Amino acid sequence: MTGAVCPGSFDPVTLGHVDIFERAAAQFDEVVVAILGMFDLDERIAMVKESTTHLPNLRVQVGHGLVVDFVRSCGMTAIVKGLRTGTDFEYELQMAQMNKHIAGVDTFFVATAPRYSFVSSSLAKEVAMLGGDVSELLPEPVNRRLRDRLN
Amino acid sequence: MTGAVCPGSFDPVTLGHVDIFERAAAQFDEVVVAILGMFDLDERIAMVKESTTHLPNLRVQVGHGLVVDFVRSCGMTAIVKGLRTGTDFEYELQMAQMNKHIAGVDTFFVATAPRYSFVSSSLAKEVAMLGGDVSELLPEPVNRRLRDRLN
Amino acid sequence: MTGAVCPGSFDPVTLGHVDIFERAAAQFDEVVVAILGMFDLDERIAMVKESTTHLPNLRVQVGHGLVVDFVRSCGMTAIVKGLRTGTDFEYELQMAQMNKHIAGVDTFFVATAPRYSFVSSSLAKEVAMLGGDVSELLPEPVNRRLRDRLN
Amino acid sequence: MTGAVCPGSFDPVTLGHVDIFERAAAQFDEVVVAILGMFDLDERIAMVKESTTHLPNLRVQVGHGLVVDFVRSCGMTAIVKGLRTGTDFEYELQMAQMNKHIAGVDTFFVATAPRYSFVSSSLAKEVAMLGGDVSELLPEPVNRRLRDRLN
Amino acid sequence: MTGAVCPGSFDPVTLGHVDIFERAAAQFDEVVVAILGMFDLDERIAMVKESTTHLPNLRVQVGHGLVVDFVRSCGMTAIVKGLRTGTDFEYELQMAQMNKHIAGVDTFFVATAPRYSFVSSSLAKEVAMLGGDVSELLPEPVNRRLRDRLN
Amino acid sequence: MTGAVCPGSFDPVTLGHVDIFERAAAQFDEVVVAILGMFDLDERIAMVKESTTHLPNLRVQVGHGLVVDFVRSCGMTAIVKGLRTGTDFEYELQMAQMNKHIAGVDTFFVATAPRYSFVSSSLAKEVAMLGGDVSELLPEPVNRRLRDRLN
Ligand SMILES: O=C(O)CCn1ccc2ccccc21
Ligand SMILES: O=C(O)CCn1ccc2ccccc21
Ligand SMILES: O=C(O)CCn1ccc2ccccc21
Ligand SMILES: O=C(O)CCn1ccc2ccccc21
Ligand SMILES: O=C(O)CCn1ccc2ccccc21
Ligand SMILES: O=C(O)CCn1ccc2ccccc21
């Protein structure tokens, strides 16, 4: 009866994201990954699903966007977002306060583990295009697809 | 004989802006709102004028842009800018120092009241388009026009 | 079966604190306020208890300190802390990462509401001693005791 | 009829401080330097007075402390504070919001010039004790007194 | 046998950049300025070369981009980058950590001198287009070319 | 003929420190760890020496303090300092600029590896006293001594 929504573009999902999903999943009864580019919708959904098989209380869903509306529709009142190096925290704070104002939804921030604290969807893609090895920072399902869209 | 310029795009003006205008207006002999998109020039001017009728020592003017040139032309030497959650303060500081360097103009920053600290022109528009209620964060003259550009 | 610990000195508890307690209480099955100076232990406990009567799933407890040990003893794995203006977030982040490292405990941060975002136990006391009125920022049970320790 | 108060310990006054005093003095009808340690009260007053002879509309006064009370007594509603490298801006912002809450007083922040942006009373003293030359960062009246309290 | 790479777009090179180049050049055996828009490639190369004649151990080179690959090819293991007001340090830190992860390359940050701390290629161009005088913040070779692309 | 000084209290030295020492040692001809409390001087020296046997070009020395004087005496012109989570970077920047002003010495900052980014001498001691296991974050020579000063 407790629930958190984890919203993002997830293009593609990274290990920093999965770290947060695991932590949300361990603290709330249900977690919903809301997928709000390099990969299309079902590729992103599939990559999230394939990377979260170990989390039975998590589900993935496309969202169309006011995150607070999505949260409110799912019957929840909490958003969970990760923090990593390069997160624009002032903007996240502005959105958190706006979201509480308009829909009464709370946002809980949690720091990603240090080893995954410097990956982001954008940087991983940019580095990947130029032949940098980011495979230790992304799930296998993502590495698999990233390799294909190279050769 | 004292004067401050409050520069911005004001697309649209928010209650965070009007809060700063009121504070400038109470500390300087004259305030000039310099309007430097969703709304066109006179819509923005009209919304600022309609939202500042209670400030007889404030006037609104379109500006074409080096803010310091505008300030210097008006016979003033001070810029007043607000700070809110999500303000890029490092960039504002860079511009403040550049502005002092090139024209000797000082920039005074003042924090918007907490209740209006999370609204910004951009976020208010984006939330408004998606049916979020931001009317408590914007002046009536703006809410009025925002409603029309919806229906 | 879900639970969060809200740790602090609470000397005295403020409305920013109670705001966070309410949000924790609404998202977790049990909340434990861990009280880790101007007021002594039971005064602090009493002020927290008196200010949280509307939260049946919250309890107050003195803690002796590694917060993670307290959390682990209570059968929980989550800490919830508020953020306000003046919070030393880099230090909170350092502690959050250390806490995850040593005991696997997650820390969730949530922003206090804007109206209570500038109060802190320290500043409220310092302002109170000098005759400033901070009563709108503190619970009645605290205002009551603060008045007495004045006259 | 406009006025700003510039509060601080000024132990001792630095060129970063005098830079702000000059900018306040040029934008307001009256400026009051409120002196709220290495030097005693009149040494600090004397050093401020000696360093501001070129500012006829500035006066120096000892203050006993809620700054807002001092401001309100002088008939003003504005505080002006400088920002330099190492300023704890989050704490200054917390105090600015508290000050507006309790007495309706506004606080205007202005960045000190780059050349004086790294001096602070504390660092100048600590460096001076260890024989570092900080004379280009402090007024002559201060350098004069600092030399004596060395030999 | 020690070496640092200083990467950037340098469009155009500023005195903040040359300050960092000088400091790198004084601490490492070789410095390579890697040029990764208003000016084309050889204009940028020429402006860097003309502004660094006093640095015999510095050379300029176009780079095609993973900076770490460029560094590794030159036989070095260090990147040197400047910090100025408005630098997005969190993003630089994210890239520094990613760069160490993928290629084992270290990044050393050094603060530009205060007098050049507020210039950036972008701001200098934008100010220059609008007739602001930024000549004290840019090398003569750049001022010379900037003047021409005006008249 | 190149050299960096790494200054600090090192009470005790941590793996975040040794990470920086290794990176300095790999980029400069000589590194000098300047030791400027829980452990006394030779305990700290011994712990640094024992933790740096793999760095032949590093030496340890007690310093008496203006760091810039120490640097200048050793014949060097560079300070190398690490950044970790909780570092007061604004204060480090203020000192870096002051140090350049008074002695022309440059300060290069480098980010500690993510896995050691949350340890600090202070936090490691405080956690250690309360029975937290920080052994993965400190060198064996330190863990050895920390164990003894427990039993
Ligand atoms: O927009 C996005 O996809 C990023 C938003 N986000 C959500 C969870 C999470 C965890 C770490 C870093 C960023 C995160
Ligand atoms: O570009 C803009 O319009 C914003 C610039 N600005 C000017 C006054 C003010 C008050 C609060 C927040 C931002 C503000
Ligand atoms: O040490 C303390 O008491 C403050 C720690 N803390 C815990 C909850 C909370 C909410 C807002 C601000 C600070 C808070
Ligand atoms: O407490 C203090 O004395 C510092 C407060 N302060 C007041 C004016 C000013 C200018 C630059 C830097 C700090 C300043
Ligand atoms: O992208 C760029 O060109 C800026 C990157 N950069 C490199 C050296 C340097 C010095 C001061 C400021 C920025 C700097
Ligand atoms: O005062 C101190 O000992 C810390 C100063 N310091 C020097 C190197 C280093 C590396 C990581 C973190 C802090 C560091």
Side-chain angles (χ1 to χ4, degrees):
Chain A
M1 75 167 306
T2 67
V5 174
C6 291
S9 49
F10 308 109
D11 182 46
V13 65
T14 71
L15 286 182
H17 299 139
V18 175
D19 178 39
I20 300 311
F21 297 163
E22 295 176 339
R23 301 160 94 142
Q27 304 302 341
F28 296 84
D29 287 309
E30 180 175 1
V31 178
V32 177
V33 180
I35 307 185
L36 281 309
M38 172 170 300
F39 302 93
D40 73 332
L41 248 328
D42 190 40
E43 280 179 309
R44 300 180 193 182
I45 301 167
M47 286 182 293
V48 175
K49 275 171 106 293
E50 296 177 31
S51 306
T52 56
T53 65
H54 61 306
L55 303 175
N57 65 328
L58 180 155
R59 48 171 267 252
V60 186
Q61 227 213 269
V62 170
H64 306 254
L66 266 199
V67 183
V68 288
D69 288 339
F70 189 96
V71 173
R72 276 276 126 115
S73 292
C74 295
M76 299 167 261
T77 178
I79 289 155
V80 173
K81 321 248 298 199
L83 304 175
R84 42 98 184 159
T85 304
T87 291
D88 184 341
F89 192 42
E90 264 247 295
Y91 186 55
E92 291 292 343
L93 288 168
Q94 191 194 359
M95 293 197 298
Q97 300 295 46
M98 180 63 82
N99 283 339
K100 181 71 180 187
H101 174 77
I102 69 186
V105 169
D106 299 310
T107 300
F108 291 89
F109 296 99
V110 44
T112 74
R115 60 204 217 179
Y116 301 132
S117 62
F118 56 85
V119 71
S120 69
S121 288
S122 290
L123 187 59
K125 284 181 300 189
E126 277 139 15
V127 171
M129 174 212 185
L130 308 186
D133 180 21
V134 293
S135 60
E136 301 170 70
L137 308 181
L138 304 177
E140 271 133 7
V142 175
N143 293 325
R144 177 172 109 229
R145 288 186 178 61
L146 209 41
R147 278 151 198 158
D148 297 345
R149 264 174 117 286
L150 246 61
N151 315 338
Chain B
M1 75 167 306
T2 67
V5 174
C6 291
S9 49
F10 308 109
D11 182 46
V13 65
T14 71
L15 286 182
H17 299 139
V18 175
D19 178 39
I20 300 311
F21 297 163
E22 295 176 339
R23 301 160 94 142
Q27 304 302 341
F28 296 84
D29 287 309
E30 180 175 1
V31 178
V32 177
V33 180
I35 307 185
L36 281 309
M38 172 170 300
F39 302 93
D40 73 332
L41 248 328
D42 190 40
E43 280 179 309
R44 300 180 193 182
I45 301 167
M47 286 182 293
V48 175
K49 275 171 106 293
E50 296 177 31
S51 306
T52 56
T53 65
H54 61 306
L55 303 175
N57 65 328
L58 180 155
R59 48 171 267 252
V60 186
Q61 227 213 269
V62 170
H64 306 254
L66 266 199
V67 183
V68 288
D69 288 339
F70 189 96
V71 173
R72 276 276 126 115
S73 292
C74 295
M76 299 167 261
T77 178
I79 289 155
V80 173
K81 321 248 298 199
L83 304 175
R84 42 98 184 159
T85 304
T87 291
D88 184 341
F89 192 42
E90 264 247 295
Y91 186 55
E92 291 292 343
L93 288 168
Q94 191 194 359
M95 293 197 298
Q97 300 295 46
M98 180 63 82
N99 283 339
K100 181 71 180 187
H101 174 77
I102 69 186
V105 169
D106 299 310
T107 300
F108 291 89
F109 296 99
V110 44
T112 74
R115 60 204 217 179
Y116 301 132
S117 62
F118 56 85
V119 71
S120 69
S121 288
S122 290
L123 187 59
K125 284 181 300 189
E126 277 139 15
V127 171
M129 174 212 185
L130 308 186
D133 180 21
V134 293
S135 60
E136 301 170 70
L137 308 181
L138 304 177
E140 271 133 7
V142 175
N143 293 325
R144 177 172 109 229
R145 288 186 178 61
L146 209 41
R147 278 151 198 158
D148 297 345
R149 264 174 117 286
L150 246 61
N151 315 338
Chain C
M1 75 167 306
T2 67
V5 174
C6 291
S9 49
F10 308 109
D11 182 46
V13 65
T14 71
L15 286 182
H17 299 139
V18 175
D19 178 39
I20 300 311
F21 297 163
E22 295 176 339
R23 301 160 94 142
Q27 304 302 341
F28 296 84
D29 287 309
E30 180 175 1
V31 178
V32 177
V33 180
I35 307 185
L36 281 309
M38 172 170 300
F39 302 93
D40 73 332
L41 248 328
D42 190 40
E43 280 179 309
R44 300 180 193 182
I45 301 167
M47 286 182 293
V48 175
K49 275 171 106 293
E50 296 177 31
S51 306
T52 56
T53 65
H54 61 306
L55 303 175
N57 65 328
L58 180 155
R59 48 171 267 252
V60 186
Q61 227 213 269
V62 170
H64 306 254
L66 266 199
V67 183
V68 288
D69 288 339
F70 189 96
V71 173
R72 276 276 126 115
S73 292
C74 295
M76 299 167 261
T77 178
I79 289 155
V80 173
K81 321 248 298 199
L83 304 175
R84 42 98 184 159
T85 304
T87 291
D88 184 341
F89 192 42
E90 264 247 295
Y91 186 55
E92 291 292 343
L93 288 168
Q94 191 194 359
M95 293 197 298
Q97 300 295 46
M98 180 63 82
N99 283 339
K100 181 71 180 187
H101 174 77
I102 69 186
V105 169
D106 299 310
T107 300
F108 291 89
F109 296 99
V110 44
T112 74
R115 60 204 217 179
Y116 301 132
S117 62
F118 56 85
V119 71
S120 69
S121 288
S122 290
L123 187 59
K125 284 181 300 189
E126 277 139 15
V127 171
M129 174 212 185
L130 308 186
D133 180 21
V134 293
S135 60
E136 301 170 70
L137 308 181
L138 304 177
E140 271 133 7
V142 175
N143 293 325
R144 177 172 109 229
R145 288 186 178 61
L146 209 41
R147 278 151 198 158
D148 297 345
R149 264 174 117 286
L150 246 61
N151 315 338
Chain D
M1 75 167 306
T2 67
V5 174
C6 291
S9 49
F10 308 109
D11 182 46
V13 65
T14 71
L15 286 182
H17 299 139
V18 175
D19 178 39
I20 300 311
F21 297 163
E22 295 176 339
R23 301 160 94 142
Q27 304 302 341
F28 296 84
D29 287 309
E30 180 175 1
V31 178
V32 177
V33 180
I35 307 185
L36 281 309
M38 172 170 300
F39 302 93
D40 73 332
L41 248 328
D42 190 40
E43 280 179 309
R44 300 180 193 182
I45 301 167
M47 286 182 293
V48 175
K49 275 171 106 293
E50 296 177 31
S51 306
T52 56
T53 65
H54 61 306
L55 303 175
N57 65 328
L58 180 155
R59 48 171 267 252
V60 186
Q61 227 213 269
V62 170
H64 306 254
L66 266 199
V67 183
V68 288
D69 288 339
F70 189 96
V71 173
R72 276 276 126 115
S73 292
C74 295
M76 299 167 261
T77 178
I79 289 155
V80 173
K81 321 248 298 199
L83 304 175
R84 42 98 184 159
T85 304
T87 291
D88 184 341
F89 192 42
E90 264 247 295
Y91 186 55
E92 291 292 343
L93 288 168
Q94 191 194 359
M95 293 197 298
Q97 300 295 46
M98 180 63 82
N99 283 339
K100 181 71 180 187
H101 174 77
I102 69 186
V105 169
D106 299 310
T107 300
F108 291 89
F109 296 99
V110 44
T112 74
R115 60 204 217 179
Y116 301 132
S117 62
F118 56 85
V119 71
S120 69
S121 288
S122 290
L123 187 59
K125 284 181 300 189
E126 277 139 15
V127 171
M129 174 212 185
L130 308 186
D133 180 21
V134 293
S135 60
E136 301 170 70
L137 308 181
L138 304 177
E140 271 133 7
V142 175
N143 293 325
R144 177 172 109 229
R145 288 186 178 61
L146 209 41
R147 278 151 198 158
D148 297 345
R149 264 174 117 286
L150 246 61
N151 315 338
Chain E
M1 75 167 306
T2 67
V5 174
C6 291
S9 49
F10 308 109
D11 182 46
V13 65
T14 71
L15 286 182
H17 299 139
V18 175
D19 178 39
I20 300 311
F21 297 163
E22 295 176 339
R23 301 160 94 142
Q27 304 302 341
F28 296 84
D29 287 309
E30 180 175 1
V31 178
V32 177
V33 180
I35 307 185
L36 281 309
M38 172 170 300
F39 302 93
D40 73 332
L41 248 328
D42 190 40
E43 280 179 309
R44 300 180 193 182
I45 301 167
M47 286 182 293
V48 175
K49 275 171 106 293
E50 296 177 31
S51 306
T52 56
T53 65
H54 61 306
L55 303 175
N57 65 328
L58 180 155
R59 48 171 267 252
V60 186
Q61 227 213 269
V62 170
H64 306 254
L66 266 199
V67 183
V68 288
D69 288 339
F70 189 96
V71 173
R72 276 276 126 115
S73 292
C74 295
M76 299 167 261
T77 178
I79 289 155
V80 173
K81 321 248 298 199
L83 304 175
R84 42 98 184 159
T85 304
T87 291
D88 184 341
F89 192 42
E90 264 247 295
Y91 186 55
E92 291 292 343
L93 288 168
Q94 191 194 359
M95 293 197 298
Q97 300 295 46
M98 180 63 82
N99 283 339
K100 181 71 180 187
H101 174 77
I102 69 186
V105 169
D106 299 310
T107 300
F108 291 89
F109 296 99
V110 44
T112 74
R115 60 204 217 179
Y116 301 132
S117 62
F118 56 85
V119 71
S120 69
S121 288
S122 290
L123 187 59
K125 284 181 300 189
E126 277 139 15
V127 171
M129 174 212 185
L130 308 186
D133 180 21
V134 293
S135 60
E136 301 170 70
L137 308 181
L138 304 177
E140 271 133 7
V142 175
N143 293 325
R144 177 172 109 229
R145 288 186 178 61
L146 209 41
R147 278 151 198 158
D148 297 345
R149 264 174 117 286
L150 246 61
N151 315 338
Chain F
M1 75 167 306
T2 67
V5 174
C6 291
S9 49
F10 308 109
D11 182 46
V13 65
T14 71
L15 286 182
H17 299 139
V18 175
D19 178 39
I20 300 311
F21 297 163
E22 295 176 339
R23 301 160 94 142
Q27 304 302 341
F28 296 84
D29 287 309
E30 180 175 1
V31 178
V32 177
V33 180
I35 307 185
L36 281 309
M38 172 170 300
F39 302 93
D40 73 332
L41 248 328
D42 190 40
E43 280 179 309
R44 300 180 193 182
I45 301 167
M47 286 182 293
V48 175
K49 275 171 106 293
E50 296 177 31
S51 306
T52 56
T53 65
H54 61 306
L55 303 175
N57 65 328
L58 180 155
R59 48 171 267 252
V60 186
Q61 227 213 269
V62 170
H64 306 254
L66 266 199
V67 183
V68 288
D69 288 339
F70 189 96
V71 173
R72 276 276 126 115
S73 292
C74 295
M76 299 167 261
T77 178
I79 289 155
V80 173
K81 321 248 298 199
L83 304 175
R84 42 98 184 159
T85 304
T87 291
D88 184 341
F89 192 42
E90 264 247 295
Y91 186 55
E92 291 292 343
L93 288 168
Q94 191 194 359
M95 293 197 298
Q97 300 295 46
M98 180 63 82
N99 283 339
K100 181 71 180 187
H101 174 77
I102 69 186
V105 169
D106 299 310
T107 300
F108 291 89
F109 296 99
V110 44
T112 74
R115 60 204 217 179
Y116 301 132
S117 62
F118 56 85
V119 71
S120 69
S121 288
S122 290
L123 187 59
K125 284 181 300 189
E126 277 139 15
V127 171
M129 174 212 185
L130 308 186
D133 180 21
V134 293
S135 60
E136 301 170 70
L137 308 181
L138 304 177
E140 271 133 7
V142 175
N143 293 325
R144 177 172 109 229
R145 288 186 178 61
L146 209 41
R147 278 151 198 158
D148 297 345
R149 264 174 117 286
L150 246 61
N151 315 338

